[PDB]
Design a protein around this ligand. Structure first.
Ligand SMILES: CNc1ccc2ccccc2n1
Ligand SMILES: CNc1ccc2ccccc2n1
Lengths: 263, 264
């Protein structure tokens, strides 16, 4: 991988592995999400950066508020996929990281993703607006003119997601993270929540449809000793409304939507 | 990746990824196990397979009976590890796949692994001895003289593992696979069982020790709708454990194993 010529974005190639694919012999959406996260980590490393600056002194970190992914073609086992990523400031609201997925052989865009990140104190878990002096520290690594993976005026990445009402049509209860679900800081990896959401989709939908779009909001994290219930209701192509909540008190951890195309 | 000069082994390099590491910023044993499985798949693909034409006609497959891994140094996040793998027939008992892990920068052996595979009918799940027709078909891809990752006389890879007696010292109950735990054939990936075994090790041991050796026997598979209980008892500077995975309901054994950990 490497930064591009202007130093304002980063590209990296990946060969799809045997254990990274589903029953269609193409990369799962969780494998895609892991690759997006890996290229984001490599971009931050390449420019000297969690992706923290003088935020370390104040115990501040970037945390994901929303992840949105659209896949047109899932790469096959053994295929090479090229991913380009970049960041942009969204004023004092937070930051945005965008990605473009391409087939290396054809050069065709096979997917796109966007994510919204907010600044939070790692100890109190209190959010805060991005101040001047921290904004300037990473503005030199971002394009100044807007560059959006989802430009379309009125698009799926900015839709408001409603809260699923009980009773849910489908559910998968008692979900728990194991050590492989944790990152280097012992926190549950953001991609595990995508897996948990998908667990309540019936197997017949997975066997006859392909996931085209997933939008996921992150409200609160699941701790290593917490247990999660995954809830889904059809709202329709097939569309679903999703809700992840703690098994005990019913505390919301995530809400989302998925759109699936018939194969 | 590529086959070596004599075409009797396969090598491949991997850069350790950010999500592949634990709290020490080094590759987990499950990341290592996934890389061993990936290099085995690429070796089979490079020589045209890992079932032969005769095996597909008879609905026969290779299944893992035992996995044994020893790690001296876990590669760090961003490091390049080189893995060499090869196979050998073990007469009519089955096949053996071996691996050697090396640090690409130093060329030093940082790990080694060995696995035993048996031939089984895909549908009835009945094991069978390897016939001559099948044996000759893959012998042209294996070294003829013995080549062992674990040559030592009384080495840990061939030890008999006893069955853990109730009550277990430690346990993790209600373990279930999710879709990410399944392979392309919708079967639970062999590496998930390694994770499940390790789930019953206390966090204090993981935080103060490093896993040096793991030996795991595979008796039966966990189906997508099955639930597993993971059981561990200390058997021991070094710490050793006896492990047992069994179905949550009837207590049917799925795996048994041992781990050896050294103090950091
Ligand atoms: C992996 N995702 C998260 C989400 C929230 C966090 C809060 C404090 C520290 C780490 C965190 N990591
Ligand atoms: C991934 N491991 C296994 C173990 C046993 C199997 C039996 C039939 C078909 C596939 C199998 N896969």
């Amino acid at each position: 991988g490497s930064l591009t010529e202007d130093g304002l974005s980063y590209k990296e190639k990946f060969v799809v592995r045997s254990y990274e694919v589903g029953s269609n012999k193409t990369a799962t959406v969780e494998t895609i999400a892991n690759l997006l996260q890996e290229v984001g980590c490599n971009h931050a490393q390449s420019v000297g950066f969690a992706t923290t600056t003088t935020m370390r002194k104040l115990h501040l970190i970037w945390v994901t508020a929303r992840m949105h992914i659209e896949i047109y073609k899932y790469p096959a086992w053994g295929d090479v996929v090229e991913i380009e990523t970049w960041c942009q400031s969204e004023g004092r609201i937070g930051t945005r990281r965008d990605w473009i997925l391409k087939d290396s052989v054809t050069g065709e865009v096979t997917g796109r993703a966007t994510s919204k990140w907010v600044m939070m104190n790692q100890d109190t878990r209190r959010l805060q607006k991005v101040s001047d002096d921290v904004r300037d520290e990473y503005l030199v690594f971002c394009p100044q003119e807007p560059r959006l993976a989802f430009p379309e005026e009125n698009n799926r990445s900015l839709k408001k997601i409603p809260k699923l009402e009980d009773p849910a049509q489908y559910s998968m209860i008692g979900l728990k993270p194991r050590r492989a679900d944790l990152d280097m800081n012992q926190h549950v990896n953001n991609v595990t929540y995508i897996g948990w959401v998908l667990e309540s989709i019936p197997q017949e939908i997975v066997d006859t449809h392909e996931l085209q779009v997933i939008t996921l909001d992150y409200r609160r994290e699941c701790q290593q000793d917490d247990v999660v219930d995954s809830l889904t209701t059809t709202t329709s192509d097939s569309q679903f409304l999703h809700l992840l909540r703690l098994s005990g008190d019913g505390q919301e951890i995530n809400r989302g939507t998925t759109l699936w195309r018939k194969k």
